[PDB]
Tab-separated table of C-alpha atoms in Angstrom:
chain	number	residue	atom	x	y	z
A	1	UNK	CA	-40.632	23.474	25.871
A	2	UNK	CA	-40.556	25.467	22.618
A	3	UNK	CA	-41.043	24.254	19.033
A	4	UNK	CA	-39.235	25.140	15.796
A	5	UNK	CA	-40.129	23.995	12.267
A	6	UNK	CA	-36.878	23.852	10.273
A	7	UNK	CA	-36.254	22.248	6.870
A	8	UNK	CA	-34.488	19.184	5.467
A	9	UNK	CA	-32.278	19.684	2.378
A	10	UNK	CA	-32.866	17.580	-0.709
A	11	UNK	CA	-30.009	15.752	-2.392
A	12	UNK	CA	-29.487	17.891	-5.485
A	13	UNK	CA	-29.522	15.796	-8.634
A	14	UNK	CA	-26.294	14.602	-10.211
A	15	UNK	CA	-25.108	16.167	-13.477
A	16	UNK	CA	-23.114	13.831	-15.726
A	17	UNK	CA	-21.647	14.020	-19.199
A	18	UNK	CA	-23.245	11.842	-21.877
A	19	UNK	CA	-21.340	8.730	-20.695
A	20	UNK	CA	-22.184	9.134	-17.021
A	21	UNK	CA	-18.942	10.816	-15.948
A	22	UNK	CA	-19.724	13.163	-13.022
A	23	UNK	CA	-19.783	16.900	-13.758
A	24	UNK	CA	-21.580	18.144	-10.621
A	25	UNK	CA	-22.055	16.049	-7.483
A	26	UNK	CA	-23.828	16.934	-4.237
A	27	UNK	CA	-21.503	15.991	-1.355
A	28	UNK	CA	-22.113	15.966	2.415
A	29	UNK	CA	-20.720	18.862	4.402
A	30	UNK	CA	-21.163	19.897	8.014
A	31	UNK	CA	-22.139	23.442	8.973
A	32	UNK	CA	-21.430	24.602	12.521
A	33	UNK	CA	-23.745	27.051	14.262
A	34	UNK	CA	-23.920	28.396	17.791
A	35	UNK	CA	-26.430	29.641	20.334
A	36	UNK	CA	-24.590	32.688	21.741
A	37	UNK	CA	-26.690	32.525	24.907
A	38	UNK	CA	-25.099	29.132	25.576
A	39	UNK	CA	-21.643	30.061	24.270
A	40	UNK	CA	-21.658	32.975	26.733
A	41	UNK	CA	-21.706	30.401	29.564
A	42	UNK	CA	-18.475	28.675	28.421
A	43	UNK	CA	-16.157	31.593	27.712
A	44	UNK	CA	-13.054	29.739	28.880
A	45	UNK	CA	-13.670	27.396	25.912
A	46	UNK	CA	-13.679	30.166	23.285
A	47	UNK	CA	-9.936	30.247	22.408
A	48	UNK	CA	-9.851	26.499	21.715
A	49	UNK	CA	-13.024	26.841	19.645
A	50	UNK	CA	-11.679	29.908	17.841
A	51	UNK	CA	-8.480	28.097	16.874
A	52	UNK	CA	-10.370	25.034	15.624
A	53	UNK	CA	-12.309	27.438	13.390
A	54	UNK	CA	-9.140	29.162	12.193
A	55	UNK	CA	-10.283	32.450	13.731
A	56	UNK	CA	-8.468	35.069	15.764
A	57	UNK	CA	-9.076	34.726	19.500
A	58	UNK	CA	-10.190	38.286	20.202
A	59	UNK	CA	-12.110	38.726	16.930
A	60	UNK	CA	-14.042	35.520	17.576
A	61	UNK	CA	-14.716	36.684	21.135
A	62	UNK	CA	-15.901	40.076	19.841
A	63	UNK	CA	-18.250	38.368	17.390
A	64	UNK	CA	-19.845	36.197	20.083
A	65	UNK	CA	-20.201	39.130	22.480
A	66	UNK	CA	-21.820	41.278	19.772
A	67	UNK	CA	-24.388	38.530	19.069
A	68	UNK	CA	-25.016	37.462	22.684
A	69	UNK	CA	-28.731	38.320	22.432
A	70	UNK	CA	-29.361	35.980	19.489
A	71	UNK	CA	-30.128	32.265	19.665
A	72	UNK	CA	-28.442	31.482	16.335
A	73	UNK	CA	-25.335	32.490	14.418
A	74	UNK	CA	-23.300	30.636	11.822
A	75	UNK	CA	-19.817	29.638	12.934
A	76	UNK	CA	-18.658	28.124	9.635
A	77	UNK	CA	-20.346	26.495	6.648
A	78	UNK	CA	-19.294	23.619	4.433
A	79	UNK	CA	-16.764	21.707	6.523
A	80	UNK	CA	-16.041	18.114	5.609
A	81	UNK	CA	-17.838	15.542	7.789
A	82	UNK	CA	-14.546	14.890	9.599
A	83	UNK	CA	-13.819	18.533	10.458
A	84	UNK	CA	-17.358	19.071	11.730
A	85	UNK	CA	-17.393	15.981	13.937
A	86	UNK	CA	-13.964	17.008	15.219
A	87	UNK	CA	-15.191	20.392	16.424
A	88	UNK	CA	-18.305	18.751	17.903
A	89	UNK	CA	-15.974	16.441	19.847
A	90	UNK	CA	-14.711	19.520	21.716
A	91	UNK	CA	-18.016	19.478	23.657
A	92	UNK	CA	-18.231	23.278	23.740
A	93	UNK	CA	-21.617	24.297	25.196
A	94	UNK	CA	-23.830	25.985	22.627
A	95	UNK	CA	-22.058	24.668	19.507
A	96	UNK	CA	-24.200	22.565	17.147
A	97	UNK	CA	-23.901	20.997	13.709
A	98	UNK	CA	-26.154	20.370	10.724
A	99	UNK	CA	-25.298	18.290	7.677
A	100	UNK	CA	-25.937	20.041	4.352
A	101	UNK	CA	-25.071	19.378	0.724
A	102	UNK	CA	-22.470	21.221	-1.327
A	103	UNK	CA	-21.626	20.876	-5.008
A	104	UNK	CA	-18.276	19.569	-6.149
A	105	UNK	CA	-17.256	19.932	-9.794
A	106	UNK	CA	-14.841	17.077	-10.621
A	107	UNK	CA	-13.752	18.577	-13.961
A	108	UNK	CA	-13.305	22.081	-12.524
A	109	UNK	CA	-12.496	24.797	-15.046
A	110	UNK	CA	-12.694	22.388	-17.998
A	111	UNK	CA	-16.497	22.657	-18.234
A	112	UNK	CA	-17.143	25.667	-15.988
A	113	UNK	CA	-19.252	27.753	-18.365
A	114	UNK	CA	-21.553	24.947	-19.516
A	115	UNK	CA	-22.242	23.494	-16.067
A	116	UNK	CA	-22.293	26.724	-14.056
A	117	UNK	CA	-22.457	26.618	-10.275
A	118	UNK	CA	-24.688	26.799	-7.188
A	119	UNK	CA	-25.118	29.150	-4.222
A	120	UNK	CA	-23.772	28.604	-0.741
A	121	UNK	CA	-27.445	27.671	-0.268
A	122	UNK	CA	-27.117	24.983	-2.989
A	123	UNK	CA	-29.243	27.040	-5.410
A	124	UNK	CA	-28.421	27.121	-9.128
A	125	UNK	CA	-26.917	30.460	-10.171
A	126	UNK	CA	-25.214	29.963	-13.570
A	127	UNK	CA	-25.265	27.688	-16.622
A	128	UNK	CA	-27.018	24.319	-16.545
A	129	UNK	CA	-27.263	24.543	-12.741
A	130	UNK	CA	-29.507	27.589	-13.204
A	131	UNK	CA	-31.413	26.516	-16.317
A	132	UNK	CA	-32.308	23.074	-14.891
A	133	UNK	CA	-32.513	24.150	-11.260
A	134	UNK	CA	-36.083	22.875	-10.964
A	135	UNK	CA	-35.117	19.459	-12.346
A	136	UNK	CA	-31.997	19.271	-10.181
A	137	UNK	CA	-33.188	20.729	-6.868
A	138	UNK	CA	-35.940	18.329	-5.857
A	139	UNK	CA	-38.063	19.189	-2.819
A	140	UNK	CA	-36.752	19.819	0.722
A	141	UNK	CA	-38.201	18.114	3.772
A	142	UNK	CA	-39.415	19.408	7.113
A	143	UNK	CA	-37.955	18.605	10.537
A	144	UNK	CA	-39.040	19.422	14.087
A	145	UNK	CA	-36.892	20.137	17.144
A	146	UNK	CA	-37.705	21.456	20.619
A	147	UNK	CA	-35.915	24.247	22.498
A	148	UNK	CA	-35.848	25.832	25.963
A	149	UNK	CA	-36.001	29.447	27.152
A	150	UNK	CA	-32.275	29.861	26.432
A	151	UNK	CA	-32.830	28.422	22.944
A	152	UNK	CA	-30.963	25.184	23.680
A	153	UNK	CA	-32.126	22.457	21.289
A	154	UNK	CA	-33.195	19.658	23.639
A	155	UNK	CA	-34.368	16.849	21.344
A	156	UNK	CA	-35.204	16.215	17.698
A	157	UNK	CA	-38.897	15.367	18.009
A	158	UNK	CA	-39.693	13.756	14.650
A	159	UNK	CA	-39.598	14.278	10.880
A	160	UNK	CA	-42.609	15.978	9.293
A	161	UNK	CA	-42.144	15.769	5.507
A	162	UNK	CA	-39.540	13.620	3.764
A	163	UNK	CA	-37.186	15.422	1.408
A	164	UNK	CA	-37.377	14.402	-2.247
A	165	UNK	CA	-34.061	14.244	-4.152
A	166	UNK	CA	-33.458	16.006	-7.426
A	167	UNK	CA	-33.163	14.116	-10.678
A	168	UNK	CA	-30.051	13.076	-12.570
A	169	UNK	CA	-29.240	15.072	-15.704
A	170	UNK	CA	-27.050	13.720	-18.497
A	171	UNK	CA	-25.630	16.479	-20.672
A	172	UNK	CA	-24.787	16.182	-24.359
A	173	UNK	CA	-21.157	17.025	-23.519
A	174	UNK	CA	-18.641	14.228	-23.984
A	175	UNK	CA	-16.079	14.939	-21.278
A	176	UNK	CA	-13.274	13.271	-23.242
A	177	UNK	CA	-13.951	15.710	-26.093
A	178	UNK	CA	-14.363	18.649	-23.703
A	179	UNK	CA	-10.898	17.945	-22.266
A	180	UNK	CA	-9.328	17.830	-25.725
A	181	UNK	CA	-11.127	21.020	-26.788
A	182	UNK	CA	-10.283	22.831	-23.547
A	183	UNK	CA	-6.635	21.752	-23.709
A	184	UNK	CA	-6.053	22.679	-27.367
A	185	UNK	CA	-7.907	26.002	-27.219
A	186	UNK	CA	-5.909	27.016	-24.141
A	187	UNK	CA	-2.578	26.052	-25.733
A	188	UNK	CA	-3.603	27.970	-28.863
A	189	UNK	CA	-4.295	31.220	-27.013
A	190	UNK	CA	-1.009	31.060	-25.096
A	191	UNK	CA	0.999	30.430	-28.265
A	192	UNK	CA	-0.649	33.241	-30.256
A	193	UNK	CA	-0.779	35.528	-27.203
A	194	UNK	CA	-4.557	35.831	-27.489
A	195	UNK	CA	-7.109	37.276	-25.074
A	196	UNK	CA	-10.145	34.979	-25.241
A	197	UNK	CA	-11.705	32.252	-27.335
A	198	UNK	CA	-14.361	29.604	-27.804
A	199	UNK	CA	-14.557	26.136	-29.299
A	200	UNK	CA	-17.796	24.286	-30.066
A	201	UNK	CA	-18.182	20.677	-31.244
A	202	UNK	CA	-21.572	19.265	-32.162
A	203	UNK	CA	-22.993	16.040	-33.553
A	204	UNK	CA	-24.431	17.040	-36.934
A	205	UNK	CA	-26.935	14.156	-36.950
A	206	UNK	CA	-28.376	14.579	-33.444
A	207	UNK	CA	-27.682	18.257	-32.741
A	208	UNK	CA	-25.990	17.344	-29.451
A	209	UNK	CA	-23.304	19.763	-28.289
A	210	UNK	CA	-20.409	17.395	-27.652
A	211	UNK	CA	-18.083	20.135	-26.360
A	212	UNK	CA	-18.337	23.811	-25.470
A	213	UNK	CA	-15.273	25.510	-24.024
A	214	UNK	CA	-14.173	29.119	-23.509
A	215	UNK	CA	-11.068	30.980	-22.430
A	216	UNK	CA	-10.595	32.531	-19.991
A	217	UNK	CA	-12.278	30.198	-17.504
A	218	UNK	CA	-12.381	29.575	-13.746
A	219	UNK	CA	-12.506	26.809	-11.156
A	220	UNK	CA	-16.120	26.699	-9.871
A	221	UNK	CA	-14.845	24.898	-6.753
A	222	UNK	CA	-12.828	28.028	-5.816
A	223	UNK	CA	-14.584	31.239	-6.888
A	224	UNK	CA	-12.458	33.626	-4.827
A	225	UNK	CA	-11.218	36.742	-6.638
A	226	UNK	CA	-13.279	35.845	-9.710
A	227	UNK	CA	-12.998	38.225	-12.683
A	228	UNK	CA	-16.173	39.015	-14.667
A	229	UNK	CA	-14.355	38.401	-17.953
A	230	UNK	CA	-13.582	34.860	-16.790
A	231	UNK	CA	-17.257	34.019	-16.232
A	232	UNK	CA	-18.450	34.921	-19.752
A	233	UNK	CA	-19.721	31.881	-21.690
A	234	UNK	CA	-18.432	33.395	-24.906
A	235	UNK	CA	-19.667	30.576	-27.153
A	236	UNK	CA	-23.207	31.760	-26.386
A	237	UNK	CA	-22.954	35.437	-25.346
A	238	UNK	CA	-20.165	36.892	-27.521
A	239	UNK	CA	-21.669	38.106	-30.806
A	240	UNK	CA	-19.633	38.849	-33.911
A	241	UNK	CA	-20.060	39.405	-37.619
A	242	UNK	CA	-19.083	35.999	-39.058
A	243	UNK	CA	-17.379	37.345	-42.183
A	244	UNK	CA	-16.264	34.816	-44.764
A	245	UNK	CA	-17.469	31.848	-42.688
A	246	UNK	CA	-20.976	32.469	-44.095
A	247	UNK	CA	-19.910	32.844	-47.722
A	248	UNK	CA	-20.742	29.110	-48.126
A	249	UNK	CA	-24.375	29.984	-47.359
A	250	UNK	CA	-24.320	32.739	-49.965
A	251	UNK	CA	-23.074	30.038	-52.357
A	252	UNK	CA	-25.898	27.672	-51.370
A	253	UNK	CA	-28.316	30.471	-52.232
A	254	UNK	CA	-26.561	30.840	-55.587
A	255	UNK	CA	-26.634	27.139	-56.468
A	256	UNK	CA	-30.280	26.941	-55.356
A	257	UNK	CA	-31.313	29.932	-57.504
A	258	UNK	CA	-31.069	28.072	-60.822
A	259	UNK	CA	-28.696	30.728	-62.173
A	260	UNK	CA	-25.289	29.397	-61.086
A	261	UNK	CA	-23.254	26.222	-61.526
A	262	UNK	CA	-19.859	25.393	-59.981
A	263	UNK	CA	-18.051	25.783	-63.322
A	264	UNK	CA	-19.198	29.389	-63.762
A	265	UNK	CA	-16.503	32.071	-63.774
A	266	UNK	CA	-16.695	35.496	-62.125
A	267	UNK	CA	-14.319	38.328	-63.016
A	268	UNK	CA	-12.905	39.878	-59.825
A	269	UNK	CA	-10.238	42.132	-61.354
A	270	UNK	CA	-8.839	44.382	-59.954
A	271	UNK	CA	-9.784	43.059	-56.516
A	272	UNK	CA	-12.152	45.978	-55.867
A	273	UNK	CA	-15.732	46.872	-56.793
A	274	UNK	CA	-17.367	50.296	-56.406
A	275	UNK	CA	-21.013	50.570	-55.305
A	276	UNK	CA	-22.033	54.182	-54.771
A	277	UNK	CA	-19.953	55.684	-51.972
A	278	UNK	CA	-18.532	52.293	-50.948
A	279	UNK	CA	-15.665	50.158	-52.230
A	280	UNK	CA	-15.643	46.377	-51.803
A	281	UNK	CA	-12.118	45.021	-51.402
A	282	UNK	CA	-10.543	41.572	-51.704
A	283	UNK	CA	-7.568	40.537	-49.587
A	284	UNK	CA	-6.110	38.408	-52.404
A	285	UNK	CA	-5.901	40.800	-55.339
A	286	UNK	CA	-3.683	38.059	-56.775
A	287	UNK	CA	-6.560	36.829	-58.951
A	288	UNK	CA	-8.427	38.162	-61.990
A	289	UNK	CA	-11.072	35.472	-62.586
A	290	UNK	CA	-12.322	32.816	-60.175
A	291	UNK	CA	-14.729	29.938	-60.487
A	292	UNK	CA	-17.278	29.403	-57.727
A	293	UNK	CA	-14.959	27.123	-55.736
A	294	UNK	CA	-12.113	29.609	-56.119
A	295	UNK	CA	-14.302	32.380	-54.716
A	296	UNK	CA	-14.489	30.499	-51.417
A	297	UNK	CA	-10.801	29.505	-51.509
A	298	UNK	CA	-9.641	33.077	-52.136
A	299	UNK	CA	-12.503	34.451	-49.973
A	300	UNK	CA	-13.348	36.888	-52.761
A	301	UNK	CA	-15.620	39.604	-51.396
A	302	UNK	CA	-15.860	41.003	-54.935
A	303	UNK	CA	-16.835	37.604	-56.322
A	304	UNK	CA	-19.512	36.775	-53.773
A	305	UNK	CA	-20.926	40.299	-54.106
A	306	UNK	CA	-21.285	39.983	-57.880
A	307	UNK	CA	-23.165	36.719	-57.362
A	308	UNK	CA	-25.333	38.429	-54.748
A	309	UNK	CA	-26.348	41.225	-57.115
A	310	UNK	CA	-27.372	38.612	-59.669
A	311	UNK	CA	-29.443	36.377	-57.370
A	312	UNK	CA	-30.658	39.008	-54.925
A	313	UNK	CA	-30.154	39.387	-51.207
A	314	UNK	CA	-33.519	37.795	-50.341
A	315	UNK	CA	-32.342	34.364	-51.478
A	316	UNK	CA	-29.175	34.706	-49.397
A	317	UNK	CA	-31.072	36.009	-46.373
A	318	UNK	CA	-33.457	33.051	-46.542
A	319	UNK	CA	-30.686	30.432	-46.411
A	320	UNK	CA	-28.921	32.210	-43.538
A	321	UNK	CA	-32.197	32.482	-41.640
A	322	UNK	CA	-33.077	28.826	-42.259
A	323	UNK	CA	-29.729	27.466	-41.016
A	324	UNK	CA	-30.154	29.471	-37.816
A	325	UNK	CA	-27.855	32.488	-38.081
A	326	UNK	CA	-29.057	35.191	-35.706
A	327	UNK	CA	-32.027	32.965	-34.769
A	328	UNK	CA	-33.083	31.617	-31.391
A	329	UNK	CA	-31.246	28.340	-30.782
A	330	UNK	CA	-33.963	27.181	-28.406
A	331	UNK	CA	-31.349	26.211	-25.826
A	332	UNK	CA	-32.709	28.647	-23.244
A	333	UNK	CA	-29.249	29.052	-21.749
A	334	UNK	CA	-28.896	31.814	-19.126
A	335	UNK	CA	-27.649	34.991	-20.777
A	336	UNK	CA	-27.646	33.432	-24.255
A	337	UNK	CA	-27.565	36.053	-26.995
A	338	UNK	CA	-29.525	35.768	-30.219
A	339	UNK	CA	-27.573	38.070	-32.523
A	340	UNK	CA	-29.209	39.915	-35.409
A	341	UNK	CA	-30.114	39.047	-39.016
A	342	UNK	CA	-32.171	42.075	-40.094
A	343	UNK	CA	-34.473	41.738	-43.099
A	344	UNK	CA	-35.400	44.511	-45.539
A	345	UNK	CA	-38.415	44.936	-47.787
A	346	UNK	CA	-36.083	46.180	-50.533
A	347	UNK	CA	-32.354	45.470	-50.406
A	348	UNK	CA	-29.997	48.252	-51.534
A	349	UNK	CA	-26.751	47.290	-53.236
A	350	UNK	CA	-24.474	47.959	-50.254
A	351	UNK	CA	-26.644	46.012	-47.811
A	352	UNK	CA	-26.862	43.199	-50.371
A	353	UNK	CA	-23.078	42.885	-50.668
A	354	UNK	CA	-22.321	43.173	-46.944
A	355	UNK	CA	-24.803	40.385	-46.185
A	356	UNK	CA	-23.230	38.162	-48.834
A	357	UNK	CA	-19.699	38.389	-47.401
A	358	UNK	CA	-20.884	38.132	-43.813
A	359	UNK	CA	-20.907	41.623	-42.306
A	360	UNK	CA	-24.664	42.245	-42.551
A	361	UNK	CA	-25.457	40.013	-39.561
A	362	UNK	CA	-24.331	39.154	-36.034
A	363	UNK	CA	-24.193	35.601	-34.642
A	364	UNK	CA	-22.777	33.492	-31.812
A	365	UNK	CA	-20.303	30.628	-32.131
A	366	UNK	CA	-23.084	28.184	-31.241
A	367	UNK	CA	-25.279	29.503	-34.075
A	368	UNK	CA	-22.391	29.284	-36.539
A	369	UNK	CA	-21.716	25.675	-35.525
A	370	UNK	CA	-25.426	24.888	-35.808
A	371	UNK	CA	-25.445	26.351	-39.310
A	372	UNK	CA	-22.430	24.320	-40.393
A	373	UNK	CA	-24.070	21.200	-38.953
A	374	UNK	CA	-27.042	21.814	-41.258
A	375	UNK	CA	-24.755	21.974	-44.286
A	376	UNK	CA	-22.841	18.892	-43.101
A	377	UNK	CA	-25.996	16.858	-42.385
A	378	UNK	CA	-26.808	16.889	-46.131
A	379	UNK	CA	-28.843	20.073	-45.727
A	380	UNK	CA	-30.951	18.851	-42.787
A	381	UNK	CA	-31.094	21.154	-39.769
A	382	UNK	CA	-31.611	19.456	-36.399
A	383	UNK	CA	-32.317	21.348	-33.149
A	384	UNK	CA	-29.414	21.987	-30.817
A	385	UNK	CA	-29.382	20.138	-27.498
A	386	UNK	CA	-27.271	20.620	-24.381
A	387	UNK	CA	-28.565	17.276	-23.034
A	388	UNK	CA	-28.083	13.709	-24.214
A	389	UNK	CA	-30.762	12.673	-26.699
A	390	UNK	CA	-32.062	9.125	-27.022
A	391	UNK	CA	-33.253	9.269	-30.650
A	392	UNK	CA	-32.134	11.073	-33.805
A	393	UNK	CA	-34.423	14.132	-33.826
A	394	UNK	CA	-36.716	15.036	-36.665
A	395	UNK	CA	-34.821	17.626	-38.680
A	396	UNK	CA	-35.786	20.165	-41.320
A	397	UNK	CA	-34.405	20.001	-44.860
A	398	UNK	CA	-33.379	23.644	-45.274
A	399	UNK	CA	-30.885	23.061	-48.120
A	400	UNK	CA	-31.503	20.562	-50.907
A	401	UNK	CA	-29.207	17.514	-50.554
A	402	UNK	CA	-27.791	18.178	-54.035
A	403	UNK	CA	-26.765	21.741	-53.163
A	404	UNK	CA	-25.487	20.722	-49.718
A	405	UNK	CA	-23.390	18.002	-51.364
A	406	UNK	CA	-21.921	20.502	-53.845
A	407	UNK	CA	-21.008	23.074	-51.188
A	408	UNK	CA	-19.627	20.292	-48.989
A	409	UNK	CA	-17.308	19.424	-51.865
A	410	UNK	CA	-16.254	23.044	-52.296
A	411	UNK	CA	-15.397	23.420	-48.606
A	412	UNK	CA	-13.391	20.193	-48.858
A	413	UNK	CA	-11.444	21.827	-51.687
A	414	UNK	CA	-11.059	24.888	-49.452
A	415	UNK	CA	-9.099	22.702	-47.032
A	416	UNK	CA	-7.398	20.401	-49.541
A	417	UNK	CA	-6.943	22.245	-52.857
A	418	UNK	CA	-3.829	24.247	-53.708
A	419	UNK	CA	-3.585	27.597	-51.974
A	420	UNK	CA	-6.181	26.435	-49.458
A	421	UNK	CA	-6.109	26.303	-45.670
A	422	UNK	CA	-3.864	23.231	-45.554
A	423	UNK	CA	-3.303	23.595	-41.797
A	424	UNK	CA	-6.957	22.561	-41.401
A	425	UNK	CA	-6.396	19.080	-42.847
A	426	UNK	CA	-7.082	16.187	-40.467
A	427	UNK	CA	-4.616	13.286	-40.894
A	428	UNK	CA	-6.486	10.163	-41.943
A	429	UNK	CA	-9.697	12.019	-42.815
A	430	UNK	CA	-11.242	14.251	-45.439
A	431	UNK	CA	-12.251	17.443	-43.639
A	432	UNK	CA	-14.099	20.473	-44.999
A	433	UNK	CA	-14.324	23.992	-43.663
A	434	UNK	CA	-13.918	27.717	-44.160
A	435	UNK	CA	-11.893	30.411	-42.396
A	436	UNK	CA	-12.809	34.002	-41.658
A	437	UNK	CA	-12.091	37.173	-39.723
A	438	UNK	CA	-14.886	38.249	-37.398
A	439	UNK	CA	-15.785	41.777	-36.332
A	440	UNK	CA	-17.659	43.134	-33.300
A	441	UNK	CA	-18.406	46.810	-33.848
A	442	UNK	CA	-18.983	48.498	-30.494
A	443	UNK	CA	-16.624	52.481	-29.332
A	444	UNK	CA	-14.429	49.610	-30.571
A	445	UNK	CA	-13.915	47.152	-33.449
A	446	UNK	CA	-12.593	43.775	-32.255
A	447	UNK	CA	-11.247	41.227	-34.746
A	448	UNK	CA	-11.410	37.467	-34.172
A	449	UNK	CA	-9.936	34.550	-36.092
A	450	UNK	CA	-12.581	31.991	-37.064
A	451	UNK	CA	-12.569	28.512	-38.508
A	452	UNK	CA	-15.721	26.458	-39.055
A	453	UNK	CA	-15.893	22.990	-40.538
A	454	UNK	CA	-17.004	19.385	-40.298
A	455	UNK	CA	-15.677	15.864	-40.809
A	456	UNK	CA	-15.493	13.278	-42.253
A	457	UNK	CA	-16.469	14.316	-45.788
A	458	UNK	CA	-17.701	10.821	-46.682
A	459	UNK	CA	-20.340	10.750	-43.921
A	460	UNK	CA	-20.050	13.933	-41.841
A	461	UNK	CA	-20.464	13.287	-38.130
A	462	UNK	CA	-19.341	16.403	-36.244
A	463	UNK	CA	-19.120	20.140	-36.862
A	464	UNK	CA	-16.695	22.463	-35.128
A	465	UNK	CA	-16.188	26.206	-34.673
A	466	UNK	CA	-12.942	27.715	-33.373
A	467	UNK	CA	-12.908	31.381	-32.295
A	468	UNK	CA	-9.650	33.059	-31.261
A	469	UNK	CA	-9.926	36.655	-30.055
A	470	UNK	CA	-7.457	39.198	-31.550
A	471	UNK	CA	-4.245	37.135	-31.756
A	472	UNK	CA	-1.236	39.337	-31.029
A	473	UNK	CA	1.371	37.018	-32.603
A	474	UNK	CA	-0.248	40.279	-37.169
A	475	UNK	CA	-1.219	37.636	-39.748
A	476	UNK	CA	-3.791	35.985	-37.508
A	477	UNK	CA	-6.525	35.109	-40.003
A	478	UNK	CA	-5.285	31.499	-40.183
A	479	UNK	CA	-4.649	31.054	-36.456
A	480	UNK	CA	-7.758	28.935	-35.785
A	481	UNK	CA	-7.142	26.377	-38.552
A	482	UNK	CA	-4.532	24.266	-36.664
A	483	UNK	CA	-6.812	24.088	-33.612
A	484	UNK	CA	-9.601	22.698	-35.798
A	485	UNK	CA	-7.204	20.053	-37.123
A	486	UNK	CA	-5.879	18.825	-33.764
A	487	UNK	CA	-9.303	18.788	-32.105
A	488	UNK	CA	-11.092	17.262	-35.099
A	489	UNK	CA	-8.435	14.530	-35.276
A	490	UNK	CA	-8.816	13.758	-31.575
A	491	UNK	CA	-12.617	13.850	-31.653
A	492	UNK	CA	-12.957	11.518	-34.640
A	493	UNK	CA	-10.643	9.002	-32.958
A	494	UNK	CA	-12.401	9.232	-29.591
A	495	UNK	CA	-15.793	8.649	-31.254
A	496	UNK	CA	-14.446	5.625	-33.211
A	497	UNK	CA	-15.211	7.209	-36.589
A	498	UNK	CA	-13.616	5.197	-39.437
A	499	UNK	CA	-10.938	7.101	-41.384
A	500	UNK	CA	-11.682	7.915	-45.019
A	501	UNK	CA	-8.417	9.543	-46.231
A	502	UNK	CA	-5.669	7.006	-46.070
A	503	UNK	CA	-2.750	7.526	-46.514
A	504	UNK	CA	-2.376	10.441	-44.090
A	505	UNK	CA	-2.182	8.775	-40.661
């Protein structure tokens, strides 16, 4: 007698990793709904129905009696096809089913922050699911069904508009590398008794983000009792002052200025330098004079500041801006933070020095990895991508290949030379990188352990950033280096990259 114009869900598009491994799959579920006007005519059936739904007898009865005037209530949503058909087989008057779609995340917490999740209505709410919701969602259809005066659906009349399925999306993530990264970062936090962390791996030639993992994390298939801290995609929303990890870009500015050469010597004695009301301090007051490579190895704040006064902060600012520090990544990720790299018309001495040793700016882990990928790719910046790319993108030469090559060699000495971060070495390969201690001024002042590098030195393929938040187990400045080593070793092997430092493995 009556007529209703309901909808037909679209099969939400599959999300895969770059090799086609499934990251988010739309699966069939059965939702049960009732017409209370019909249920009210079969009350002797309610206890059996209530038990099949895992509901208390009297509470289920109360719920039906409270809604007896309606023609529609939900009984349960998202049952497997088998469960739904099993309740339908009870032949309870007024109980109906509809088949919907529901996401399943086969890798669970391993890639939770990148992929995000959907609504109970299959709508993208976080991460890629949100950002690409238009691509993934498709277009629903339109169905028609007739009803009586009691609201009883008599017959499905026809189908009006055919649903249109969403489109497949292949991410840049390599799930083999994501597992390695997720496993090693997690083990690292437990061993150092750390709070949170991030690890980013990217292809320096294509800009593809091959892994992006954070701790803590969560299972998107089971979001009960979910803590807000666990949902933060720290690689893109946690901002910090990168500290010594951007001294290599101060150096690039120096070697590009025409005024400095690697063999130059800077006097750092006595490990401090006064500028007005401020005092610059070196951790290693062991040294009196350092060459340019030694300044990075010892992480001399005094040394890099003296270079900065000579070349000027503008030259340093320009390199840091051009490699993407505190600049929009273009990834358009939900909640992504851009940081801050403030310019000045005139640079005072203090602001000059603090920029040079990495406290005059705020960045994300993704930006820091992008910047190291520019240095690794022989000075050529390529845009970041969260999706698989089919051609090497056009890059921008932001650092001359000669300077990039020199600084590459210095960072390789940072890892390999005496007194350097030896725990960063990758067996079988020549790796290069730089360690640092981050700072997020807030009222608070959090300290993070950072390592950023790339490999292999002969033809760099991937860049990596490891962030470990305030390790409690407190010489923690070199806590991230061993994570870089293990993950870089596993990544190079998984990507079939030929070793260039035998004998080591």
